[PDB]
């Protein structure tokens, strides 16, 4: 399966501290780790670990951070070839402080050097992939990549989360729009997930889904309400479950056109990742997955 | 020509400019970011060099890109890095800094465990060759060695007594001048009332003790007497390394003048002028620009 992931890549700089700052002054971290993130980036890593030809299309700087981010993606088996590296530019990143009790302070810097312009996408031949997954954190890239992919007759999958911008026009370009409870609520202005999914369906000729963590995943199939329960597992690290689900769902939808099979498969990949520690290091492969899924 | 040594830490500061300092947990958004070299002893050295002293920086760095960037910046400012130890396959230290609209800063330092605390290397160096040795409290074993050597040689010792996890009692005792921060002095004494604290601190050393209280200025004890130098009210632009620059200027002034009152005024001025001029280490004035700014106030 050939997969493209369009969206954002951010370097998390994690500082483990005795207590979260709270007041001003100098503090000393007991420990430090540098892990890449971003919805479309983690989704790509998931799809690669499941053994797809996976490409990540996003924006980085010509700085050390840019190099660190794209090198990690490659090391995970994600091709960075069509990612735009901007000259004399800083990449997006976050400083994160983490308490003993698991409480987090996040300072995100979205780099203004990485321009929202998405005319760069026209240089890419989109026919070369079976599915294009996009996140809603780079609206102009999502819209271009989906238009190109539709012109080429390629499958489109959206990670429809909470964003300030209206994603009505994006849901319409989506063959599969997989929302989050908040994402779906913002779009429809309806807080009852059932009614919302029905409202959302009217916006697209494609399929609509809402993920509710432990409550599992709901979706509409020809006006019929369908559901896949969440897998009861001993959760250890929930860092990127939603991103990993979208990655697996794209691969599964491309391989097995079956919605029900695809959603079960994704729910499993996500669940297995939550058991294994190390965030991106916890993501299973088509073998570790098939095995976990056999525990039925 | 004052010959100055600065012993301690050199780190890459990762500066995040935010709307407000984080008080509680959750997500925040930086308006802007810069990666600038820092560290107390390193910035103190840069300040002393800009004031026109033969300045040496003695600390520990990695063999990584960051290490090279840090030592190159120090040299570019005219600080000799000749006695700094490069560890041959190691990452250098770093800090994340959040900076509010008003210039107030939260600094979260990560000391690289690759830079080992061993300081016995210092014994090979001839401490006689300097007029004053300034140390910060972040490299405990280097501070203690450098001050013992400098004392054996009869060289002046100046301490930047800031917040560190370890107890700096033994360091204050080796200090001819111990210039604390409100938090640093509180951690040392476990007394939050600065007057009583300074009195407790004095008992630890045959030297002089001072506490810096930002806008409330600098207090110090001279033969049991409370002495004070007010902070200079200036149009503040950049708060970068103000405290570090103060210690740098204070060391140079104490070596040149031997006058406490004059020295502390002079340092408070270097720091104040730096707060007006932007570019952090590019904002630090010289003995001339400073003397000029200090004279101009009686006229405003
Ligand atoms: O807050 P000030 O007094 O200006 O000192 C700041 C500084 O010198 O110290 C930090 C490390 S730690 O605090 O010593 O661990 C460095 O990142 C920074 O350059």
Count Cβ atoms within 10 A of the Cβ of residue B5 and give its class: 0-12 exposed, 13-18 middle, 19 or more buried: buried
User: Are B108 and A90 a contacting pair at CB < 8 A?
Assistant: no
Task: Search chain A and give the residue with CA nearest B182.
Answer: A25
Q: Which residues contact A247 (CB under 8 A, 6 or more apart)?
A: A5, A42, A43, A44, A45, A46, A47, A50, A133, A269
User: Are B109 and A13 a contacting pair at CB < 8 A?
Assistant: no
**What burial letters (b/e) apply to A99-138, b meaning 16+ CB within 10 Å?**
eeeeeebbbbbebebbeeebeebeebebeebbbbbbbbbb
Task: Search chain A and give the residue with CA nearest B31.
Answer: A109
- Chain A residues within 8 A of B25 when measuring between CB atoms: 20, 99, 103-105
Quick check: A205 and A185 in contact, CB under 8 A?
A: no
Pocket test for ligand 1, best of B15, B38, B93 (most atoms within 8 A of CB): B38
Q: Which of A209, A224, A198, A192 is nearest to A262 (CA)?
A: A209
Range of the domain at A64: 1-296
In whole angstroms, give the CA distance from residue A85 to residue A129: 22
Quick check: A195 and A228 in contact, CB under 8 A?
A: no
Residues with CB under 6 A from ligand 1: A 26, 28; B 9, 11, 13, 38-40, 43, 95, 107, 109, 138, 162, 241-244
Q: Give me A295's structure tokens.
A: 């525990």
Closest-CA distance of chain B to residue A27, Å: 5
∠ CA B137-B68-A84, nearest 5°, is 120
Q: Which of A126, A196, A138 is nearest to A163 (CA)?
A: A138
In whole angstroms, give the CA distance from residue B56 to residue B133: 9
How many other CB atoms are found less than 10 A from the CB of residue A291?
A: 12
Report in angstroms the alpha-carbon separations of A38 from A59, A110, A242, B145, B299: 12, 12, 11, 47, 57
Q: Which residues contact B283 (CB under 8 A, 6 or more apart)?
A: B237, B238, B240, B273, B274, B275, B276, B277
What technique was this entry resolved by?
X-ray
Q: Give me A178's structure tokens.
A: 């997989």
Phi, psi for residue A100 in degrees, rounded to 5: -60, -35
Q: Which of A132, A130, A131 is nearest to A143 (CA)?
A: A132
Q: Give me B216's structure tokens.
A: 């409330």
In whole angstroms, give the CA distance from residue B188 to residue B196: 12
Resolution of this entry in Å? 3.0
* Residue A17 contacts B, CB cutoff 8 Å: yes
Report in angstroms the alpha-carbon separations of A78 from A45, A47, A48, A53, A157: 6, 9, 6, 8, 18
Identify the helix (H) or strand (E) that includes residue A68. Answer: helix A64-75
The string of DSSP letters for A180-231 reads EHHHHHHHH--SSHHHHHHHHHTT-SSEEEEE-GGG-EEEEETTEEEEEPPP
Q: How many structural domains is chain A composed of? A: 1
Quick check: B21 and B98 in contact, CB under 8 A?
A: yes
How many other CB atoms are found less than 10 A from the CB of residue B23?
A: 12
Identify the helix (H) or strand (E) that includes residue A32. Answer: strand A31-37
In whole angstroms, give the CA distance from residue B86 to residue B58: 11
- Chain A residues within 8 A of B30 when measuring between CB atoms: 107-109
In whole angstroms, give the CA distance from residue B232 to residue B290: 12
What number of residues does chain B have? 300
Strand A84-85 with A59-60, pairing: parallel
Q: Which of A185, A184, A260 is nearest to A222 (CA)?
A: A260
How many other CB atoms are found less than 10 A from the CB of residue A227?
A: 12
Report in angstroms the alpha-carbon separations of A250 from A173, A212, B175: 15, 18, 66
Q: Which atom, in ligand 1's list, is nearest to the CA of B138?
A: 14
- Chain B residues within 8 A of A22 when measuring between CB atoms: 22-24
- Chain B residues within 8 A of A108 when measuring between CB atoms: 27-30
Q: Which of A125, A98, A112 is nearest to A32 (CA)?
A: A98
Q: Which of B239, B185, B205 is nearest to B38 (CA)?
A: B239
Phi/psi zone of residue A292: left (φ > 0), alpha (ψ -120 to 50 degrees), beta?
Answer: alpha
**Residue B80 per-residue DSSP state:** B
Count Cβ atoms within 10 A of the Cβ of residue B25 and give its class: 0-12 exposed, 13-18 middle, 19 or more buried: middle
**Residue B91 per-residue DSSP state:** P
């Amino acid at each position: 399966i050939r997969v493209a992931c369009v969206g954002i890549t951010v370097m998390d700089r994690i500082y483990y501290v005795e207590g979260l700052p709270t007041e001003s002054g100098k503090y000393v971290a007991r420990n430090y780790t540098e892990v890449g993130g971003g919805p479309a980036a983690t989704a790509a890593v998931a799809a690669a670990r499941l053994g797809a030809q996976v490409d990540f299309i996003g924006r980085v700087g010509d700085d050390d951070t840019g190099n660190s981010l794209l090198a990690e993606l490659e090391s995970w088996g994600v091709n960075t070839r069509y990612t735009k590296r901007y000259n004399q530019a800083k990449s997006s990143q976050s400083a994160i402080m983490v308490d003993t009790k698991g409480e987090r302070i996040i300072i995100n810097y979205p780099s203004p050097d990485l321009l929202p312009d998405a005319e760069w996408l026209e240089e890419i031949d989109f026919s070369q992939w079976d599915v294009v997954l996009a996140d809603v954190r780079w609206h102009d890239g999502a819209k271009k990549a989906f238009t190109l992919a539709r012109q080429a007759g390629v499958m489109t999958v959206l990670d429809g989360d909470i964003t300030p911008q209206d994603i009505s026009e994006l849901v319409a370009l989506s063959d599969h729009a997989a929302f989050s409870e908040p994402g779906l609520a913002r779009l429809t202005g309806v807080k009852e997930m059932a009614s919302a999914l029905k409202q959302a369906q009217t916006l697209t000729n494609g399929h609509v889904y809402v993920t509710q963590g432990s409550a599992g995943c709901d979706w509409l199939e020809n006006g019929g309400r369908q559901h896949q329960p969440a897998f009861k597992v001993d959760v250890v690290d929930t860092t990127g479950a939603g991103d990993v689900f979208h990655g697996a769902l794209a691969v599964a939808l491309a391989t097995s056109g079956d919605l029900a099979e695809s959603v079960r498969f994704a729910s499993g990949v996500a669940a297995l990742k939550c058991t294994r520690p190390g965030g991106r290091a916890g993501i299973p492969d088509c073998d570790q997955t098939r095995s976990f899924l056999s525990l039925f």
